[PDB]
Design a protein around this ligand. Structure first.
Ligand SMILES: Nc1nc2ccccc2[nH]1
Ligand SMILES: Oc1ccc(Cl)cc1O
Ligand SMILES: Oc1ccc(Cl)cc1O
Lengths: 188, 185
């Protein structure tokens, strides 16, 4: 990940004007839509939190959790730490990132800071549900000037995405002011 | 460097009791001694600064500044960013690190933050002197409880090194309380 840390602008885009900041969300959304497309119900929820972190969750199968034979760490960690632009870029440029994977009846939890895992992926409990959730806090060391998520930029993009992805429910929630939207298109 | 960041204790030593914190200084000192031996004057100065950083300087030839043909960056950057455990470990676990190299009539400077270079090694001026200097600020995210450098732990190890490296002068300075020593065999 040090290649991304050396020149963040080359991977995420302009880190001053806010376009790079919002590209962080859309990169994670693309991964969530991919996971949502595999599965029948297909819902993603994008939440702008009061602390200016964003979470993106899907109810798909859950990203793989088994140990990668070569890398010697969970497949999830490989996805988060090995170089659209990839979720590993978002991880590298986030001062904190929380990963929650529900898969094979088990809840898996891992925490990252600036792309560095704080511990190995751990089974913390049990669950009837399946899916992946990433919540990330953009790095204030990288993202300057514009450091807050504008609702309208996300809302407009997710509406455009809904029409390309049939049967996928996309919910947008703003916990700062309670503003909500639900984009769901059934075409085909 | 992410392997070091992931398990700092395995490379530097215990990050809570102060062992790891002081090993950061000793790792830089090892490289300073090697450089000091290859020069004429053969002196190292270890300075504990008031803001809880440590600088280690030698008066040797200066570490190489030219572009590494494989890595495609300065040889100095390769030393600071590629895996004694190496100064790259110290760089990875320092919230800031300042590198200054005096070599071939020129002063070179570079700044790192958590092992990430902020710019390429750059020529900032001219000089007749030669040597290398690294000043590092230990990461308070990694190093907990014992965050401040105890003078006597450093003094003890530098004394041992002065006997083993008989030709090399070693000065220790503490800018917090003005305490100082000069170890030379
Ligand atoms: N604050 C901070 N910034 C970092 C960049 C890379 C790795 C660890 C870091 N901790
Ligand atoms: O829902 C998600 C699915 C996959 C990734 Cl990498 C991130 C997500 O947030
Ligand atoms: O004096 C020094 C010489 C070489 C290195 Cl890598 C670090 C120093 O501080």
């Amino acid at each position: 990940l040090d290649a991304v840390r050396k020149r963040p602008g080359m991977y995420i885009g302009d880190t001053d004007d806010g376009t790079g900041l919002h590209h962080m969300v859309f990169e994670v959304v693309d991964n969530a839509i991919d996971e949502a497309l595999a599965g029948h119900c297909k819902e993603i929820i994008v939440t702008i939190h009061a602390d200016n972190s964003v979470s993106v969750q899907d109810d798909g199968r859950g990203i793989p959790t088994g140990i990668h034979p070569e890398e010697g760490v969970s497949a999830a960690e490989v996805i988060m730490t090995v170089l659209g632009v990839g979720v590993s870029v978002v991880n590298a440029l986030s001062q904190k990132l929380e990963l929650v994977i529900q898969r094979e009846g088990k809840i898996h939890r891992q925490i990252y800071e600036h792309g560095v895992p704080q511990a190995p992926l751990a089974v913390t409990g049990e669950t009837e549900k399946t899916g992946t959730m990433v919540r990330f806090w953009p790095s204030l060391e990288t993202f300057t000037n514009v450091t807050e998520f504008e609702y309208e930029i996300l809302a407009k993009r997710l509406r455009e995405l809904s029409f390309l992805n049939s049967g996928v429910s996309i919910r947008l929630r703003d916990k700062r002011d309670g503003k909500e939207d639900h984009f769901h298109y059934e075409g085909g």
